[PDB]
Design a protein around this ligand. Structure first.
Ligand SMILES: Cc1cc2nc3c(=O)[nH]c(=O)nc-3n(C[C@H](O)[C@H](O)[C@H](O)COP(=O)(O)OP(=O)(O)OC[C@H]3O[C@@H](n4cnc5c(N)ncnc54)[C@H](O)[C@@H]3O)c2cc1C
Ligand SMILES: O=c1[nH]c(=O)c2[nH]c(=O)[nH]c2[nH]1
Length: 389
């Protein structure tokens, strides 16, 4: 009856990705007991964690993970696809000073592992795939495909971009929108024949991108973007040849990358987003992370946004036990932010990948005249609009 006492407030968190584990950690900080449920039986290339996300991780008590595994990112450059020459290059030092943290690219595998380690695998029930939630005046209940169910006071749906709970919260089923390009990504060992080990290097041209950024342990996170129709007959077996075709004529470092990579460990993903929602919560249930907002990766803010969601979620429960009031405040704080992030990503996606090839050529022109000041400013804007400023 006094809801502050241990065992009187139970949150059910669905999903053990970045969002779910962040949310559980944040809820626990605010004195709420969480049971975490995850669909897959076992976990299974990288994420750029900008300073807004880093400060969130620090706030959540998980700062050591970022310091330890974050790649040494200190500068960036854009290179011409033919010449391979610098169009613009500059250090990120100024951004790090304005935002208060260094950027931390981290391998997805390592980030996930460390966060599970931190939360503790024993407090996660795997093979638990949620199908339905229902709420009464007393609480909320969810059902799992294996026939079990669980009840609690609060439900956090952090079940990803294909969220099963999302339709119940919204009242309809949003659909994923193909963003018009395909991303190939993976990891390779740092070889300065490709690019500098402390910088994020992107080759641009023809509405395409080839990118390298350092994660931990002397490795590069790499990705290739190509504007393409969805559904092409292309997989890991067709991979090297596909990339060779798509990037014919591109500077030698790119050919070096295509030869260096391992197709068996390289991901090919057709990029989608979802039109932003105007609601994130319903009763005792809140969407968090990709479940509440699904963006293209184009400004590297997807995982950061889920961390931001969690920080705000913990904060709204810090000094209240009125679930309905807390979740309305969560929604109030998050909804405009994640809308802007999805739309910002979308716009950048469209400029980068030649939706209008002239706008794209104009962007390349701006990169030729770029000192770094305008880009740094733009990045700071995105970062400083986060909950921890
Ligand atoms: C190619 C690419 C590059 C990216 N780069 C960046 C970047 O540089 N920086 C950045 O900040 N973000 C980046 N992102 C975005 C980032 O990866 C995601 O936003 C982030 O992983 C979302 O976390 P999440 O927990 O909400 O979703 P997920 O990581 O997808 O986790 C959801 C979890 O829920 C589980 N689940 C699904 N359905 C059910 C069910 N019904 N019942 C129970 N559990 C279920 C899933 O198994 C999964 O473990 C990138 C994304 C992509 C695709
Ligand atoms: O602009 C991008 N930033 C990223 O952090 C990222 N990650 C990715 O796969 N594609 C992109 N694009």
């Amino acid at each position: 009856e006094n809801l502050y006492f241990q065992g009187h407030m139970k949150a059910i968190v669905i999903g053990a990705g970045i969002g779910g584990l962040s949310a559980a950690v944040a809820l626990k900080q605010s004195g709420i007991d969480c049971d975490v449920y995850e669909a897959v039986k076992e976990i299974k290339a990288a994420i750029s964690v900008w300073p807004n996300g880093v400060k969130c991780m620090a706030h959540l008590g998980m700062g050591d993970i970022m310091e330890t595994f974050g790649g040494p990112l200190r500068r960036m450059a854009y290179r011409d696809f033919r010449s391979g020459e610098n169009m613009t290059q500059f250090s990120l030092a100024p951004l790090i000073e304005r935002t208060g943290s260094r950027p931390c690219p981290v391998s997805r595998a390592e980030l996930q592992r460390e966060m599970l380690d931190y939360w503790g695998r024993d407090s996660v029930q795997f093979g638990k795939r949620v199908t339905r939630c229902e709420e009464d005046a007393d609480g909320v209940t969810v059902w799992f495909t294996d026939g079990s169910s669980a009840s609690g006071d609060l439900l956090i749906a952090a079940d990803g971009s294909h969220s099963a709970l999302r339709p119940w919260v919204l009242g309809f089923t949003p659909q994923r929108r193909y963003a018009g390009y395909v991303n190939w990504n993976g990891l390779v060992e740092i070889d300065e024949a490709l690019a500098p080990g402390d910088q994020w290097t992107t080759f641009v041209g023809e509405g395409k991108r080839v990118s390298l950024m350092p994660v931990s342990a002397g490795r590069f996170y790499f990705f290739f973007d190509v504007p393409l129709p969805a559904g092409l007959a292309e997989d890991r077996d067709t991979l090297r040849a596909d990339l060779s075709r798509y990037f014919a004529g591109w500077a030698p470092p790119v050919q070096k990358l295509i030869a260096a990579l391992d197709p068996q460990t390289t991901n090919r993903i057709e990029i989608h987003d979802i039109e932003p929602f105007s609601r994130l919560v319903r009763g005792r249930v809140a969407l968090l992370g990709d479940a509440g907002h699904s963006t293209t990766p184009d400004i590297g803010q997807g995982g950061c946004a889920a961390m931001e969601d969690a920080v705000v979620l913990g904060a709204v429960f810090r000094q209240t036990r009125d679930i309905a009031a807390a979740l309305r405040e969560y929604e109030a704080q998050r909804c405009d932010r994640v809308r802007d992030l999805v739309l910002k990503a979308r716009k950048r996606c469209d400029i980068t990948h030649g939706k209008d090839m002239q706008l794209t050529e104009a962007w390349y022109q701006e990169l030729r005249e770029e000192t770094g000041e305008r880009i740094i400013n733009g990045m700071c804007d995105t970062i400083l609009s986060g909950p921890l400023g």
